[PDB]
């Protein structure tokens, strides 16, 4: 019976602080409407005024579903701004109230609570740990763990998935371990869904859980998900390639055994398309991913070789963008540092020398040194075959010596020393 669209913040406060049930609802919805426009939700105002612990009390009203809905929405939108704003919501005691709301028989209310808990947890690790500490995980999973999720609207599923993802998201600290153990089985299952937003959200969640110590990598790999990650990595028609790749790249920063789960699940067969993908970001992340594989054991470098990936790295090292070329360098250096003499010979056959040397004119010190170390590594294989003299002439006759000599008049002492060592040892 009123113009809730055109109430003022003042009107709201009087409305809320009233003892009349209908004006309370009316106020709460006027609030909701203001927070729902684009042009500057008066968020600070609402807090200033001391409404949050009233809204929080409204969440408690089982008697009045509409007032639960209206405050949930209102709080959600507060909680979707700054840390201070989000904090006001938390300071108000929203969290345990929202968790109680998760079990409402009204789906629209439950899902509003889910959405709010997503934002609280999305702030960072502290509020995320608070949401987990207050007991959010069991009820969230109960909504998704099911014989009947099929009965959930896709918007809801996506909403839950995104919230779960936020619960898996930051570090310093990473999430509690037993919460992750509890959640992972749902994630693994959601990785077989067909909705592209569910898939992307759960893949990014897996990606976060795989970004840290070996211990974390290990709990993910043990679920048996990695073959599924590789099937997604192959879905070149979908945007899901990116998160699946992130998660696979993360897995191969772990133990040799963890890296070997990726290889055995059959990931390397996908890489020819990943390194030729026109989307340059995918090139980079696949080249980064490669470089941690060529940093692995000799039988692992050999699988990279057997799948024909080495001419692809050379290709990338030669003709891709500088960011992706950096990663190419890392793959080469790790390869030369861990590889057998044969493996190194084959790399030289694939035309590694010139593109590798081209990148010595790079204005990045860390990368000049790893190029020099890789060359140095190639010369040691040449020592063992007595071909150092051959390798020297060739490097001289393709401009390589110019680029190494160039480096003696460089400012960094290390670059100067490493390059001088090469000139001495092999070009004197």
């Amino acid at each position: 019976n009123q113009g809730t669209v055109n109430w003022s913040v003042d009107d709201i406060v009087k409305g809320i602080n009233s003892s009349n049930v209908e004006n309370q609802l009316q106020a709460t919805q006027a609030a909701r409407k203001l927070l729902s426009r684009e042009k500057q939700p008066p968020i600070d105002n609402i807090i200033r005024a001391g409404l949050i612990p009233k809204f929080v009390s409204f969440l408690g009203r089982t008697d009045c579903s509409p007032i639960q809905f209206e405050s949930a929405w209102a709080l959600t939108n507060i909680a979707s701004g700054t840390s201070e704003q989000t904090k006001a919501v938390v300071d108000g005691g929203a969290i345990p109230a929202f968790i109680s709301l998760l079990a409402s028989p009204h789906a629209h209310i439950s899902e509003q609570a889910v959405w709010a808990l997503g934002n609280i947890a999305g702030d960072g690790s502290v509020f995320r740990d608070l949401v987990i500490k207050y007991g959010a995980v069991d009820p969230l999973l109960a909504l998704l763990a099911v014989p009947d999720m099929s009965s959930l609207a896709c918007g809801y599923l996506r909403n839950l998935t995104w919230t779960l993802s936020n619960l898996c998201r930051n570090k310093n600290p990473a999430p509690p371990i037993d919460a992750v153990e509890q959640i992972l089985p749902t994630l693994v299952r959601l990785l077989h869904h067909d909705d592209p937003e569910v898939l992307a959200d759960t893949c990014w969640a897996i990606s976060y859980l795989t970004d840290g110590p070996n211990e974390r990598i290990g709990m993910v790999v043990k679920t048996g998900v990695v073959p599924q990650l590789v099937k997604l990595l192959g879905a070149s028609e979908l945007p899901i390639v990116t998160p699946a790749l992130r998660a696979i790249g993360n897995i191969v920063t772990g133990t040799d055994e963890q890296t070997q789960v990726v290889i055995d699940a059959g990931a390397l067969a996908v890489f020819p398309s990943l390194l030729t993908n026109p989307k340059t970001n995918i090139q980079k992340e696949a080249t980064w991913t490669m470089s941690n594989i060529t940093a692995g054991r000799q039988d692992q470098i050999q699988q990279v070789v057997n799948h024909g990936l080495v001419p692809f790295l050379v290709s990338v090292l030669s003709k891709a963008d500088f960011k992706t070329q950096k990663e190419a360098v890392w793959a080469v250096t790790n390869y030369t540092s861990g590889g057998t003499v044969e493996q190194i010979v084959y790399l030289v056959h694939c035309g590694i020398i010139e593109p590798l040397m081209n990148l010595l004119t790079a204005k990045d010190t860390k990368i000049i040194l790893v190029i020099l170390d890789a060359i140095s590594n190639i010369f040691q294989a040449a020592e063992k075959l007595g071909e150092t003299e051959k390798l020297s002439i060739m490097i001289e006759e393709c401009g390589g010596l110019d680029k190494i000599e160039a480096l003696q008049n460089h400012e960094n002492e290390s670059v100067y020393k490493a390059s001088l060592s090469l000139i001495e040892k092999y070009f004197s």
Partner: peptide, 15 residues
């Protein structure tokens, strides 16, 4: 897509 990037950390229900 738009689905290739990380999801947003915070989302507002608008409009």
């Amino acid at each position: 897509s738009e689905l290739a990037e990380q999801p947003e950390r915070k989302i507002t229900r608008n409009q």
